[PDB]
Design an enzyme around this catalytic site. Structure first.
Site, PDB file in Angstrom:
ATOM      1  CG  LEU A  65      -2.181  -0.755   1.254  1.00 44.75           C
ATOM      2  CD1 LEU A  65      -2.771  -0.817   2.647  1.00 44.75           C
ATOM      3  CD2 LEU A  65      -3.188  -0.160   0.294  1.00 44.75           C
ATOM      4  CB  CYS A  87       7.119   3.326   2.301  1.00 43.90           C
ATOM      5  SG  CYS A  87       8.390   2.457   3.253  1.00 43.90           S
ATOM      6  CG  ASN A 102       6.951   2.970  13.058  1.00 44.94           C
ATOM      7  OD1 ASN A 102       6.799   4.199  13.148  1.00 44.94           O
ATOM      8  ND2 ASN A 102       7.080   2.206  14.131  1.00 44.94           N
ATOM      9  CG  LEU A 144       7.721  -1.615   2.682  1.00 43.65           C
ATOM     10  CD1 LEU A 144       8.310  -2.849   2.025  1.00 43.65           C
ATOM     11  CD2 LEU A 144       7.232  -0.655   1.596  1.00 43.65           C
ATOM     12  CB  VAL A 145       1.368   0.069   5.013  1.00 45.49           C
ATOM     13  CG1 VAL A 145      -0.072  -0.238   5.418  1.00 45.49           C
ATOM     14  CG2 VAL A 145       2.049   0.928   6.077  1.00 45.49           C
ATOM     15  CG  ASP A 188       3.817  12.204  10.295  1.00 40.42           C
ATOM     16  OD1 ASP A 188       4.224  13.321   9.855  1.00 40.42           O
ATOM     17  OD2 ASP A 188       3.809  11.149   9.610  1.00 40.42           O
TER      18      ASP A 188
HETATM   19  C1  OWQ Z   1       1.692   5.531   2.479  1.00 35.71           C
HETATM   20  O1  OWQ Z   1       1.800   4.781   3.707  1.00 35.71           O
HETATM   21  C2  OWQ Z   1       0.704   4.227   4.308  1.00 35.71           C
HETATM   22  C3  OWQ Z   1       0.678   4.281   5.693  1.00 35.71           C
HETATM   23  C4  OWQ Z   1      -0.374   3.718   6.406  1.00 35.71           C
HETATM   24  C5  OWQ Z   1      -1.419   3.090   5.736  1.00 35.71           C
HETATM   25  N1  OWQ Z   1      -2.486   2.619   6.520  1.00 35.71           N
HETATM   26  N2  OWQ Z   1      -2.495   2.453   7.917  1.00 35.71           N
HETATM   27  N3  OWQ Z   1      -3.655   2.067   8.326  1.00 35.71           N
HETATM   28  C6  OWQ Z   1      -4.496   2.000   7.282  1.00 35.71           C
HETATM   29  C7  OWQ Z   1      -5.852   1.671   7.144  1.00 35.71           C
HETATM   30  N4  OWQ Z   1      -6.400   1.721   5.936  1.00 35.71           N
HETATM   31  C8  OWQ Z   1      -5.656   2.028   4.875  1.00 35.71           C
HETATM   32  N5  OWQ Z   1      -6.246   2.087   3.645  1.00 35.71           N
HETATM   33  C9  OWQ Z   1      -5.479   2.717   2.585  1.00 35.71           C
HETATM   34  C10 OWQ Z   1      -5.717   4.235   2.534  1.00 35.71           C
HETATM   35  C11 OWQ Z   1      -5.392   4.552   1.066  1.00 35.71           C
HETATM   36  N6  OWQ Z   1      -5.281   3.224   0.392  1.00 35.71           N
HETATM   37  C12 OWQ Z   1      -5.729   3.172  -0.924  1.00 35.71           C
HETATM   38  C13 OWQ Z   1      -6.640   4.118  -1.445  1.00 35.71           C
HETATM   39  C14 OWQ Z   1      -7.052   3.984  -2.752  1.00 35.71           C
HETATM   40  N7  OWQ Z   1      -6.570   2.980  -3.481  1.00 35.71           N
HETATM   41  C15 OWQ Z   1      -5.702   2.070  -3.053  1.00 35.71           C
HETATM   42  C16 OWQ Z   1      -5.256   2.135  -1.753  1.00 35.71           C
HETATM   43  C17 OWQ Z   1      -6.017   2.267   1.238  1.00 35.71           C
HETATM   44  N8  OWQ Z   1      -4.366   2.350   4.949  1.00 35.71           N
HETATM   45  C18 OWQ Z   1      -3.761   2.354   6.121  1.00 35.71           C
HETATM   46  C19 OWQ Z   1      -1.414   3.043   4.325  1.00 35.71           C
HETATM   47  C20 OWQ Z   1      -0.340   3.588   3.613  1.00 35.71           C
END
Ligand code: OWQ
EC number: 2.7.11.24
Length: 281
Positions: free
Chosen positions: A9, A11, A14, A16-17, A123
């Protein structure tokens, strides 16, 4: 054996997610992998876990489990999967005042909770505020959460309070509140309120719009930026009313009470919620 099909998802600070699917229940989760590179990293990860394990609120991302290598209840934090983040929402444009106001209420509710527990967020920025667009729910991300008592250039200066720019390692509840004001202005306009790349230009951008009403604050600035010595700091050249030209007077008035130079004049999360602009929710 529980969590299958893991896709990165991005970085964080802390580590990679990843997004993954749970086998127990056919729901989606968000997993953070933290690498124990040095003994400083293990001490840091352990502080973060004890905090997030005891926090439970509607506007804080929910932590389900903590597992080590091979998955057993490197470290992995299993949290709730949110549809998107506020940064991705605002790249698409500004929000209707009704939506910005609703998201601000939720952000303030989340801050009032963590502050009451003597936790703050080191942050706070749109990328760490997670949204479910269906229910219009906003939740503050767990990573950055810290008890009040390398890659430095990758820290944004944009949501930093005048005090945090003058004292860089001192984090307080009032610092979270300054960031919340900046995010609110960004939801209303669709652009960063104070977009500096360096600590000094950020201070100069703030000073063009925010009044310095105390002599103690004025004397500190004269010891860092002496050019403003014969300028009446009480009336800025480009005030918030000018910086936000299509938004309502009610929103600007509420904003003027959060974006105060001194933390002593700034509304707390609790006070901002009791403000008439917010109390209607
Ligand atoms: C950059 O670093 C980071 C750091 C922390 C996260 N964390 N931490 N807890 C989370 C709970 N839910 C989500 N959901 C994503 C939000 C956007 N993401 C998309 C949005 C649209 N398309 C694809 C992914 C899903 N992401 C989380 C993700 C990326």
């Amino acid at each position: 054996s529980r969590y299958m099909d893991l896709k990165p998802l991005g970085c964080g600070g802390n580590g990679l997610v990843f997004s993954a699917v749970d086998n127990d229940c056919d729901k989606r989760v968000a997993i953070k992998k933290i690498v124990l590179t040095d003994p400083q990293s293990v001490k840091h990860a352990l502080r973060e876990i004890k905090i997030i394990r005891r926090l439970d609120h509607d506007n804080i991302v929910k932590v389900f489990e903590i597992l080590g290598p091979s998955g057993s209840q490197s470290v992995y934090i299993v949290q709730e999967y949110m549809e998107t983040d506020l940064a991705n929402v605002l790249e698409q444009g500004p929000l209707l005042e009704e939506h910005a106001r609703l998201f601000m209420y939720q952000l303030l509710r989340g801050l009032k909770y963590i502050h009451s527990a003597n936790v703050l967020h080191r942050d706070l920025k749109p990328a760490n505020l997670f949204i479910n667009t269906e229910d219009l729910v906003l939740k503050i991300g767990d990573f950055g959460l810290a008890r009040i008592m390398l890659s430095e250039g990758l820290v944004t200066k944009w949501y930093r309070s005048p005090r945090l720019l003058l004292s860089p390692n001192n984090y307080t509840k009032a610092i979270d509140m300054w960031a919340a004001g900046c995010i609110f202005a960004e939801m209303l306009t669709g652009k960063t309120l104070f977009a500096g790349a360096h600590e000094l230009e950020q201070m100069q951008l703030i000073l063009e719009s925010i009044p310095v009403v105390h002599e103690e604050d004025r004397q500190e600035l004269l010891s860092v930026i002496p050019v403003y010595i014969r300028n009446d700091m009480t009336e800025p050249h480009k005030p918030l009313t000018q910086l936000l030209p299509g938004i309502s007077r009610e929103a600007v008035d509420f904003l003027e009470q959060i974006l105060t130079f001194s933390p002593m004049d700034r509304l707390t999360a609790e006070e901002a919620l009791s403000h008439p602009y917010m109390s209607i929710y």
